[PDB]
Design a protein around this ligand. Structure first.
Ligand SMILES: NC(=O)C1=CN([C@@H]2O[C@H](COP(=O)(O)OP(=O)(O)OC[C@H]3O[C@@H](n4cnc5c(N)ncnc54)[C@H](OP(=O)(O)O)[C@@H]3O)[C@@H](O)[C@H]2O)C=CC1
Ligand SMILES: O=C(O)Cn1cc(Cc2nc3c(F)c(F)cc(F)c3s2)c2cccnc21
Length: 316
């Protein structure tokens, strides 16, 4: 297939990117350098990952070395939950631009639909461990994001972890100026998201699949948890194609016309994960992989389940 997908702002987004959540600051600079050398052109970042400065060091080194030009890169970051207030959005974006050492972002996402109390804590909790919400709503935050496009700080804006009703609220916003370009959501064979993906695609919103390998390094992983990389049924599909299970898991969302952002800090896996343009999964393979759905969600937090905008009470 084509290596880039067209967004509604007319820009082309590479369908394979590098994830950076949990990538330690002491290893992420090398990871991004190696990724750019072997062909990656899309990096997924966030302020909350606490490593944007070091990601920026890698990008600057490869620009200075003339391995790539800025126009060829697609850099994504996300507005954290403590900055949903209208007057905090520009400042949060500027801090990210400063750390990444860039003068614009290709895409900036609302990280989660839930606004939290502003302050220095990323997850402000009350005395009994509930997240403290802010009185912001999704629509006012969206208007502040639209301002960033008009001021030239970002080329495209989008959302992440929004359910279909929350997407709908934005699409029906009075005075909507820029539609969301992308909805970035958890997606893998144990959480296939057919309903939400169909909804988004029908509205012309591109879907990015996160945790495509099932996030085995997530901090709350338990030893008894399901493992996609070790699923013998997926191993057999990989073996039939002479590819690794990770390569099958990355190729899967690509054939559903999704963008996919696997994370690695290991140079040999960074290279392996990019070698996914030289094979195809059959229609039969795809239907079989879809059959493995178990509505098993890796990214959710119990402390957030009372927030009015918690996205995962709805079916999709
Ligand atoms: N918007 C949002 O709310 C969210 C966005 N994301 C984004 O999605 C990205 C990917 O999701 P993430 O949850 O990090 O996890 P992934 O599903 O990408 O899995 C990452 C794990 O897989 C390992 N791995 C990578 N490649 C291979 C391979 N070829 N063989 C064996 N193991 C491999 C990595 O190890 P190692 O690094 O040691 O090589 C790491 O432990 C995130 O980094 C982030 O950018 C993720 C969660 C939420
Ligand atoms: O958000 C990311 O990209 C990575 N990431 C995901 C999680 C799990 C979360 N679940 C929810 C959630 F269910 C919410 F409603 C709001 C949130 F901000 C989070 S964050 C996490 C926790 C702690 C640190 N990072 C996390």
């Amino acid at each position: 297939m084509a290596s880039r997908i067209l967004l509604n702002n007319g820009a082309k987004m590479p369908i394979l990117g590098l994830g950076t959540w949990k990538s330690p600051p002491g290893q992420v600079t090398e990871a991004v350098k190696v990724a750019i050398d072997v062909g990656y052109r899309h990096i997924d970042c966030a302020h909350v990952y606490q490593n944007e400065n070091e990601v920026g060091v890698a990008i600057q080194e490869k620009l200075r070395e003339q391995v790539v030009k800025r126009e060829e890169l697609f850099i994504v970051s996300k507005l954290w939950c403590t900055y949903h207030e209208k007057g905090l959005v520009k400042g949060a974006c500027q801090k990210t631009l400063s750390d990444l050492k860039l003068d614009y972002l290709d895409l900036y996402l609302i990280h989660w639909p839930t606004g939290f109390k502003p302050g220095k804590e990323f997850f402000p909790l009350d005395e009994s461990g509930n997240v403290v919400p802010s009185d912001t709503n999704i629509l006012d935050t969206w208007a502040a994001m639209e301002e960033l496009v008009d001021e030239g700080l970002v080329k495209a804006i989008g959302i992440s972890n929004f359910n279909h009703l929350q997407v709908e609220m934005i699409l029906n916003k009075p005075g909507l100026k820029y539609k969301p370009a992308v909805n970035q959501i958890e997606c893998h064979p144990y959480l296939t998201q057919e309903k939400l993906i169909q909804y988004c695609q029908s509205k012309g919103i591109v879907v990015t699949a996160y945790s495509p390998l099932g996030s085995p390094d997530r901090p709350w992983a338990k030893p008894e948890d399901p493992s996609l990389l070790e699923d013998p049924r997926i191993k057999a599909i990989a073996a039939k194609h002479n590819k690794t299970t990770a390569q099958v898991l990355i190729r899967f969302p690509m054939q559903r016309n999704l963008v996919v952002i696997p994370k690695s800090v290991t140079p040999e896996r960074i290279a392996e994960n990019f070698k996914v343009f030289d094979f195809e999964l059959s229609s039969q393979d795809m239907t079989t992989l879809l059959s493995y759905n178990r509505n098993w969600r890796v990214c959710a937090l119990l402390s957030c389940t009372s927030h009015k905008d918690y996205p995962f009470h709805e079916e999709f």
